[PDB]
Design a binder for this molecule. Structure first.
Ligand SMILES: *[C@@H]1O[C@H](CO)[C@@H](O[C@@H]2O[C@H](CO)[C@@H](O[C@@H]3O[C@H](CO[C@H]4O[C@H](CO[C@H]5O[C@H](CO)[C@@H](O)[C@H](O)[C@@H]5O[C@H]5O[C@H](CO)[C@@H](O)[C@H](O)[C@@H]5O)[C@@H](O)[C@H](O[C@H]5O[C@H](CO)[C@@H](O)[C@H](O)[C@@H]5O[C@H]5O[C@H](CO)[C@@H](O)[C@H](O)[C@@H]5O)[C@@H]4O)[C@@H](O)[C@H](O[C@H]4O[C@H](CO)[C@@H](O)[C@H](O)[C@@H]4O[C@H]4O[C@H](CO)[C@@H](O)[C@H](O)[C@@H]4O[C@H]4O[C@H](CO)[C@@H](O)[C@H](O)[C@@H]4O)[C@@H]3O)[C@H](O)[C@H]2NC(C)=O)[C@H](O)[C@H]1NC(C)=O
Ligand SMILES: *[C@@H]1O[C@H](CO)[C@@H](O[C@@H]2O[C@H](CO)[C@@H](O[C@@H]3O[C@H](CO[C@H]4O[C@H](CO[C@H]5O[C@H](CO)[C@@H](O)[C@H](O)[C@@H]5O[C@H]5O[C@H](CO)[C@@H](O)[C@H](O)[C@@H]5O)[C@@H](O)[C@H](O[C@H]5O[C@H](CO)[C@@H](O)[C@H](O)[C@@H]5O[C@H]5O[C@H](CO)[C@@H](O)[C@H](O)[C@@H]5O)[C@@H]4O)[C@@H](O)[C@H](O[C@H]4O[C@H](CO)[C@@H](O)[C@H](O)[C@@H]4O[C@H]4O[C@H](CO)[C@@H](O)[C@H](O)[C@@H]4O[C@H]4O[C@H](CO)[C@@H](O)[C@H](O)[C@@H]4O)[C@@H]3O)[C@H](O)[C@H]2NC(C)=O)[C@H](O)[C@H]1NC(C)=O
Ligand SMILES: CC(C)[C@H](C)[C@@H](O)[C@H](O)[C@@H](C)[C@H]1CC[C@H]2[C@@H]3COC(=O)[C@H]4C[C@H](O)[C@H](O)C[C@]4(C)[C@H]3CC[C@]12C
Ligand SMILES: CC(C)[C@H](C)[C@@H](O)[C@H](O)[C@@H](C)[C@H]1CC[C@H]2[C@@H]3COC(=O)[C@H]4C[C@H](O)[C@H](O)C[C@]4(C)[C@H]3CC[C@]12C
Ligand SMILES: *[C@@H]1O[C@H](CO)[C@@H](O[C@@H]2O[C@H](CO)[C@@H](O)[C@H](O)[C@H]2NC(C)=O)[C@H](O)[C@H]1NC(C)=O
Ligand SMILES: *[C@@H]1O[C@H](CO)[C@@H](O[C@@H]2O[C@H](CO)[C@@H](O)[C@H](O)[C@H]2NC(C)=O)[C@H](O)[C@H]1NC(C)=O
Ligand SMILES: *[C@@H]1O[C@H](CO)[C@@H](O[C@@H]2O[C@H](CO)[C@@H](O)[C@H](O)[C@H]2NC(C)=O)[C@H](O)[C@H]1NC(C)=O
Ligand SMILES: *[C@@H]1O[C@H](CO)[C@@H](O[C@@H]2O[C@H](CO)[C@@H](O)[C@H](O)[C@H]2NC(C)=O)[C@H](O)[C@H]1NC(C)=O
Ligand SMILES: *[C@@H]1O[C@H](CO)[C@@H](O[C@@H]2O[C@H](CO)[C@@H](O)[C@H](O)[C@H]2NC(C)=O)[C@H](O)[C@H]1NC(C)=O
Ligand SMILES: *[C@@H]1O[C@H](CO)[C@@H](O[C@@H]2O[C@H](CO)[C@@H](O)[C@H](O)[C@H]2NC(C)=O)[C@H](O)[C@H]1NC(C)=O
Ligand SMILES: *[C@@H]1O[C@H](CO)[C@@H](O[C@@H]2O[C@H](CO)[C@@H](O)[C@H](O)[C@H]2NC(C)=O)[C@H](O)[C@H]1NC(C)=O
Ligand SMILES: *[C@@H]1O[C@H](CO)[C@@H](O)[C@H](O)[C@H]1NC(C)=O
Ligand SMILES: *[C@@H]1O[C@H](CO)[C@@H](O)[C@H](O)[C@H]1NC(C)=O
Ligand SMILES: *[C@@H]1O[C@H](CO)[C@@H](O)[C@H](O)[C@H]1NC(C)=O
Ligand SMILES: *[C@@H]1O[C@H](CO)[C@@H](O)[C@H](O)[C@H]1NC(C)=O
Ligand SMILES: *[C@@H]1O[C@H](CO)[C@@H](O)[C@H](O)[C@H]1NC(C)=O
Lengths: 721, 727
């Protein structure tokens, strides 16, 4: 079994697709990826990020006697058959991003592969229970990563302790193991510096006593589990005098934050206690955390002036998150003594007074990049001093009591990318100098204000724009044709204003536009067929991964618009349930989550509301080819012609509203082939003929077809009579 | 020398006055046995075992040696008299067991060294409330097996406490009171000894220092009250398991020291027993720790005048079952008033003044499933907004509402004016509107205090004010009142302070004001009054008795801009308010130059007083100045400036000996300045400008000292500081 004849046996037997042609040209040492040695033997195979699709069995590669490095990460390998039985010389194995399901691969590497130093099985589909530790005859293994798999059920009491004493890095995150944490043995845990059980289902009100034996621990991550009770205090955290990162976030801890946790402050760099039910405040003992950089205490019930009596004295703070707490009063001015502050999040608290801006007038230029104080009760005007924070990229003042104009100094911040200040009483307009003298923005979210004027053609200069929201303002003028230069724009909301003119044809050049809401304006002209000219070509983009809330208007056509999408970073849902904009419709529901595309390529527009305008002409035939379109509201216009038969192509549609127009002709039969059409309304037109018998049409209420010119068939009186 | 004869030499040598004839029974005649004598008590065999002459108005010089010579004297109660100190003697074989010499004028502390060295059977000795001066040095003799209670409080002891002073007391000591002196010392250096029976200890009101507690103090396992208030203790409050040493402690006070930092959670080790806590008047920060949820016996919690903040009112205080008196004023608590505070179903007194509260006034304490026991609601000097909740009418036990210095608006609902027990209605410095109903103190409570100045009240002062016979202080200044001053005010014979300045009142100054027996402060400036100065305002001169307005927190902002500034100053009720909030109140800067005085209302006379402050300026009063005005011997401010007065300045005004401010400017006064004004030694602010005065300016007293502007615009005044009359 020659080495050159093994790799060829691997290529033919295991790999079933190589569109990169990066496994072609397959002497041993000249083959792509395989790094050889001087004496002609193969020692490593590096095929990372190759887009390879096949079935893997490690015995077919460990048969290579001198193979010590195997990199197969970033591919699409599946689990193979047991096959053959050979020794293993591997010192470094990486199988990070694949589709491996048979966890017997981990049993092999842990039983053989005795010289193994590091192995990464992460991000796969390895299933089953955790059983075997690395062999005791292995004296070298230092780092083992089994994170992000599908391992199930309990963890063996001595699973961690059974590891070789050389272990340094053990990561078990991203599974669904279970068990009382207190009954899990770490053993001697000598040399262990990094350990994570994050994102599992571990329970218990105690830590295992053996955990205290890990004197050299630098990272302890226990987040997103079900640990309960009080955070251990007294003397416990003195056991870990090297700990740089501790996370206990998103468990069920209660009580106050133990002052005794400050025995890590000699070395503690990162802390995450967020997502619990902690009260009181950060104890004064933490003034000694001269090394702390990231302090995350969000989503708890903390209160008091500990922001000034403690946090301001942390000379090296750079990332301070206390959103979703019970902190009242002014934002203390002393917080500016945090010279190195880059990200400050104080959203969803009870802060009053003025927007903090002192950070910008230090004796040194401020490095503050993100300022987030949404869902508070800040009053006054957007202070002009923020213009001196030249490193600002994200300003989130939404859902406050702000008033007055938006100073010119904000639109001139050189690196600004996100301007988020919806849900205030801000007045003024949009300068004609946006994004040209100021930063090229990604989000401009100022809906639910009192802004006046028109949207400048200068918006064409914001080529990076992903999301524009200016709904429910007092805007006027025409929609600028320059919007067409924004080929990364994904969401555009301008509803409930007084816009006039045509819907520009140039909107068709917005390559990534998936969400267009222009309801409740004064728009005229024809429907531009160019709106669908990107159907089947839309690519996703950087608008994914943003917090959003959707307010569904469940009142049919009487209620203006199909609903309301809002950027929802840092805002409690309750603050929205009491926003009178919600009660504008007698029936509402709050969908909530993170923006997520449902396609990888070749998509279409997702949400289209042009209702309540004065648009005339005929529905462009092309509109029906939008396969991912889930909402199409053209109600309350002056549309004429027939409903195109192409609408049988709206596979994804769930809400279709064409009511209150002057449409003629027949309902397309293909409407019955829409398996998700759950909200139809064609009432108040000149429609005639039978109601399609397919799909869900025969069940919609009589209200949805009424005030037409000869519709018949269930739910109406039958056509044959 | 026979017990009957010993008592005889006491009445002669010592007693110097017996105004009640308490000691009249002390005569040798019918049954000369001393047991018929008043205050004397004998044993069956006929010898004296006790002498009780308490609160008997006895005045004289005391030497105990003449009384301790009684072989069988075991009790001697002389408290509450006016005994001074005589010259001590070496000793006289003492056998006392109980000694009470409280409330006298004793000065020589050698009486204490005597009683502590002899009298080896003393169980209790009370020297409190005297003038005993000097250092502490001597503890009770080591031969005294019995002494339990020693009260040395409210004296004039000085300088260092001996490190072993407390430890050298017999081991039977249970009560030791050292408060009310000015003794110094590091508290960590003080030895309590084995502290085996001590249960009540106090060093409060002294000048004691240190940043630690003495280790010895933890030996007092049976302590029940510990009071170290009003001293100079610094540092953090002791924590760790220290308070575990006091498993019976009921009352702890560390108030008014220099403590800083947080409240130690391990202070909660008292919470099985703690009934009364007072940490007020320090620089404590943070919150009341969560460990205090277990203080189910805590009745009084006082954390006022600190830097506390947070939501501990809700997360801790609301879960305390038996809290009756809750004081958190002068802190940094922001947010809204926690509604969960209503779960405290025994709360009688709530004070949340001088914090940063926002929102509405609590409307929940009253509308509960049982009779609300709430008696005092104090939320002055916050940022509360809205209207006074009608719900307060359900708090049928309310006696005091203080909502002053907020941003409240609207009308006072009649449900406030009908609280049957209401006594103090204090809501000044707001934007309230409407008027005083016509049915005050009839359907509602007979008020002591109606303080609504600096508001937007309209209408007249109803005559039904005559029904508030308990009234002590009315303040409606700087409102929009109209109408006349009701003559019914003359029925308020307890009224001491009436402030109505800066309204649009018309009519006369009712002569019925002269029947207000206790009126000492009358302020009607900047109104539209007319008629003549009623001479009855002085009818109480020399007869005014002090009253219950005494003891209330006040602030007087003195306007130092001359007569051009309206009125002679602002007296305002100031409970629960920070002086800083007054320095930024626009009334305070209406006059350019100002200075804020503050304190507690105090009378300078015990009887036979006069009015103290009379401001009637900026009206249209005409006529002559009543001569009787000059006989107000305690009058200190008299401002009749800016009126239409005519005639001469009474020569009677030489009797205004207490006067310091006298403004008669801008009138039509005529004649000479009485030379008797020269005898007004305290006159420091005089203005008679803009009158018709003429002739020489008097030479004695201060009348030659005032600026030129204070005699100007008259018709021929001469004499220094003006040009001489002879030229
Ligand atoms: C332990 O362990 C753990 C694990 O286990 C970890 O954690 C982790 O972390 C990380 C960090 O990094 C992260 O990641 C990130 O994230 C973000 C987001 O975040 C957020 O969210 C998330 C999500 O969530 C979700 O899920 C969850 C679960 O998982 C849940 O719970 C929730 O609810 C949600 O869910 C939702 O959604 C979903 C999806 O859709 C669905 O399914 C569902 O149904 C729903 O709907 C989360 O996770 C997070 O969390 C966090 O946070 C919080 C707050 O804070 C807290 O509480 C928690 O705890 C956590 O924590 C963390 O963090 C924090 C902060 O935040 C701190 O403090 C602490 O410590 C920690 O760390 C949140 O919430 C995102 O954003 C990102 O992304 C990024 O990156 C990436 C890469 O990596 C990429 O790809 C992308 O793109 C991005 O990027 C960006 O950035 C970068 C730099 O960095 C760059 O490069 C780029 O470009 C970008 O940029 C930006 O900016 C710019 C300007 O400059 C512009 O231009 C652009 O455009 C943009 O904008 C990331 O991914 C993750 O997530 C986590 N995980 C967990 C599981 O947790 C930790 O870390 C440990 N610890 C220690 C201490 O060590
Ligand atoms: C410890 O020890 C100590 C000793 O040292 C003690 O203390 C004490 O206490 C007591 C109580 O108990 C007291 O007494 C009382 O008082 C009151 C007042 O009070 C207030 O004031 C005061 C005074 O002040 C002053 O002084 C000081 C020092 O000395 C200073 O610091 C200040 O500043 C001031 O000074 C000022 O003034 C003066 C005078 O003028 C001058 O000289 C100067 O210069 C200046 O100007 C004080 O002291 C107090 O304090 C308190 O409080 C606070 C707050 O809260 C705090 O912080 C503090 O600490 C304290 O505390 C205490 O108290 C509290 C309560 O409040 C509590 O909580 C705590 O715990 C403690 O205790 C204040 O501020 C008055 O009022 C009173 O009187 C009353 O009583 C008597 C007898 O009892 C009588 O005679 C009178 O008349 C009255 O009576 C009333 O009541 C009763 C019952 O009780 C009745 O029966 C009657 O009838 C009456 O009633 C009323 O009401 C009603 C209705 O309800 C009506 O009808 C009627 O009309 C009326 O109104 C008393 O006197 C004292 O003072 C103290 N002392 C000291 C030194 O501090 C303690 O206690 C201890 N502790 C334990 C625990 O044990
Ligand atoms: C890509 C983002 C911009 C976007 C918010 C996205 O993440 C999100 O998942 C979108 C597509 C969702 C959020 C709320 C959804 C709507 C919620 O409202 C509704 O009432 C339902 C009713 C019914 O199920 C319809 O079929 C779909 C319909 C009408 C949904 C259509 C799809 C959404 C509009
Ligand atoms: C008994 C209460 C009604 C009263 C507030 C009382 O306690 C209080 O002591 C009064 C009498 C004091 C408080 C402030 C005092 C004034 C302090 O401020 C002043 O302007 C001085 C100036 C000058 O020294 C005058 O001679 C006295 C005068 C003008 C004082 C007159 C007396 C007071 C008005
Ligand atoms: C690893 O090598 C073994 C041995 O050649 C492979 O097993 C053979 O697979 C072929 C093709 O399916 C069968 O016809 C033979 O019967 C199998 N066994 C032999 C030859 O002994 C195995 O498939 C290889 N691994 C992978 C994943 O393909
Ligand atoms: C468009 O936005 C305006 C914002 O003003 C909405 O007008 C509000 O209507 C509600 C009705 O309940 C009133 O309570 C508010 O006072 C109105 N706002 C103001 C500022 O006066 C209007 O309803 C919105 N229209 C739609 C269809 O959403
Ligand atoms: C899916 O999208 C791709 C990429 O846009 C389309 O295919 C290519 O499109 C580009 C222009 O962007 C042309 O230059 C290529 O010649 C196209 N290649 C093809 C068609 O193989 C593709 O047409 C889309 N598929 C649909 C709509 O079904
Ligand atoms: C209490 O006793 C003192 C003495 O200790 C009395 O003070 C004397 O008063 C008279 C006038 O009545 C003066 O002549 C004396 O000079 C005062 N003596 C001193 C030392 O000042 C005081 O009057 C008595 N108080 C009463 C009886 O109320
Ligand atoms: C001091 O006041 C007392 C009583 O407050 C006066 O003495 C008596 O006062 C009553 C009125 O309350 C008169 O009817 C009596 O005639 C007075 N008795 C006398 C004078 O013996 C006392 O006159 C006052 N002293 C003054 C004003 O100097
Ligand atoms: C009487 O009280 C009124 C209360 O409104 C005073 O009027 C205000 O006085 C302040 C003083 O600083 C000024 O700043 C305000 O502008 C005044 N308001 C108005 C509407 O005029 C008034 O000054 C008081 N009068 C006197 C003589 O003191
Ligand atoms: C002094 O007072 C007299 C009045 O008492 C002033 O002189 C006259 O006053 C009467 C009113 O009584 C007026 O009718 C006259 O017109 C006054 N005469 C003049 C010439 O004005 C006098 O002016 C007063 N002087 C000062 C400085 O106040
Ligand atoms: C792509 O290759 C880089 C460089 O070796 C590696 O760090 C990364 O993990 C690969 N990406 C994957 C496996 O998704
Ligand atoms: C604008 O101010 C009014 C004042 O009543 C307030 O109710 C409203 O909520 C403010 N607007 C927004 C969007 O919060
Ligand atoms: C269609 O309907 C409209 C209004 O319903 C009516 O006025 C019009 O005449 C109709 N047109 C036809 C049938 O062509
Ligand atoms: C009055 O006598 C009582 C009864 O002994 C005593 O308690 C009280 O202190 C006396 N009053 C004084 C000393 O002021
Ligand atoms: C003082 O305590 C000691 C020790 O407990 C005891 O012997 C003595 O009797 C106590 N004295 C009194 C008066 O209770």
């Amino acid at each position: 079994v020659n080495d050159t004849a093994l790799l060829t046996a691997f290529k033919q037997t295991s790999i079933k697709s190589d569109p990169t042609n990066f496994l072609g040209n397959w002497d041993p040492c000249t083959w792509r990826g395989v790094s050889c040695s001087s004496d002609g033997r193969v020692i490593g195979l590096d095929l990372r990020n190759g887009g390879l699709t096949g079935t893997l069995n490690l015995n077919n590669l460990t048969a290579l006697s001198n193979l010590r490095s195997l990199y197969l990460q970033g591919n699409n390998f599946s689990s193979g058959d047991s096959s053959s039985s050979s020794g293993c010389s591997l010192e470094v194995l990486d199988l990070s991003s694949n589709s491996l399901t048979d966890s017997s691969i981990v049993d092999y590497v842990f039983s053989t592969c005795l010289n193994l130093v590091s192995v990464n099985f992460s991000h796969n589909k390895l299933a089953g229970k955790l059983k075997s530790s690395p062999s005791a005859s292995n004296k070298r293994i230092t780092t083992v990563d089994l994170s992000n798999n599908r391992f199930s059920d309990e963890i063996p009491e001595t699973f961690i302790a059974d590891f070789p004493n050389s272990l340094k890095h053990l990561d078990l995150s991203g599974n669904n193991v279970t068990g009382d944490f207190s009954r899990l043995s770490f053993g001697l845990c000598e040399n262990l510096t990094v350990f994570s059980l994050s994102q599992n289902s571990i329970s218990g009100d105690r830590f295992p006593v053996s955990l205290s034996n890990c004197k050299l621990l630098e990272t302890l991550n226990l987040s997103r589990n079900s640990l309960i009770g009080k955070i251990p205090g007294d003397d416990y955290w003195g056991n870990f005098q090297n700990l740089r990162q501790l996370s206990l976030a998103h468990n069920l801890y209660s009580g106050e934050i133990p002052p005794e946790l400050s025995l890590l402050c000699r070395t503690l760099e990162v802390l995450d206690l967020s997502g619990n039910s902690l009260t009181g405040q950060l104890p004064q003992s933490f003034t000694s955390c001269g090394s702390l950089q990231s302090l995350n205490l969000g989503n708890n019930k903390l209160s008091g002036d500990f922001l000034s009596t403690v946090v301001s004295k942390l000379s090296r703070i750079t990332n301070l998150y206390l959103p979703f707490n019970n902190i009242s009063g002014s934002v203390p001015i002393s917080l500016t003594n945090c010279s190195n502050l880059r990200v400050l999040d104080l959203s969803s608290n009870e802060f009053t007074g003025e927007v903090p801006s002192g950070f910008c007038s230090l004796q040194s230029s401020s490095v503050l990049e993100k300022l987030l104080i949404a869902n508070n009760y800040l009053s006054g005007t957007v202070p002009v001093e923020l213009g001196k924070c030249k490193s600002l990229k994200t300003i989130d003042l939404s859902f406050n009591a702000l008033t007055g104009l938006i100073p010119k100094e904000i639109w001139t911040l050189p690196k600004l990318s996100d301007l988020v200040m919806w849900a205030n009483n801000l007045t003024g307009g949009i300068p004609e100098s946006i994004c040209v003298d100021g930063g090229n923005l990604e989000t401009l979210i100022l809906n639910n204000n009192l802004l006046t004027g028109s949207l400048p053609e200068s918006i064409s200069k914001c080529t990076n724009m992903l999301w524009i929201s200016l709904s429910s303002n007092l805007l006027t003028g025409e929609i600028p044709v320059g919007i067409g230069k924004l080929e990364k724009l994904a969401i555009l909301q301008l509803g409930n204003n007084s816009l006039t003119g045509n819907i520009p044809s140039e909107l068709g050049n917005c390559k990534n536009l998936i969400w267009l809401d222009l309801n409740s304006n004064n728009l005229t002209g024809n429907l531009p067929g160019e709106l669908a000219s990107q159907a089947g070509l839309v690519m996703p983009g950087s608008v994914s991964g943003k917090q959003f809330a959707f307010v569904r208007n469940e009142g049919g056509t009487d209620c203006r618009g199909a609903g309301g999408l809002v950027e929802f970073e840092g805002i409690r849902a309750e603050r929205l349930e009491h926003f009178p904009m919600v009660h504008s419709c007698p029936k509402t529901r709050i969908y909530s989550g993170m923006t997520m595309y449902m396609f990888s390529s070749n998509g279409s527009m997702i949400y289209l509301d042009l209702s309540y305008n004065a648009v005339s002409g005929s529905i462009p035939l092309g509109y029906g080819a939008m396969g991912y379109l889930q909402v199409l509201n053209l109600g309350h216009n002056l549309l004429t012609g027939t409903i195109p038969d192409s609408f049988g192509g709206l596979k994804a549609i769930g809400v279709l509203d064409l009511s209150h127009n002057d449409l003629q002709g027949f309902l397309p039969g293909s409407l019955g082939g829409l398996s998700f059409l759950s909200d139809l309304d064609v009432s108040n037109n000149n429609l005639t003929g039978p109601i399609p018998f397919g799909g869900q049409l025969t069940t919609f209420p009589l209200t949805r077809y009424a005030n037409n010119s000869g519709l018949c068939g269930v739910p109406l009186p039958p056509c044959s009579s």
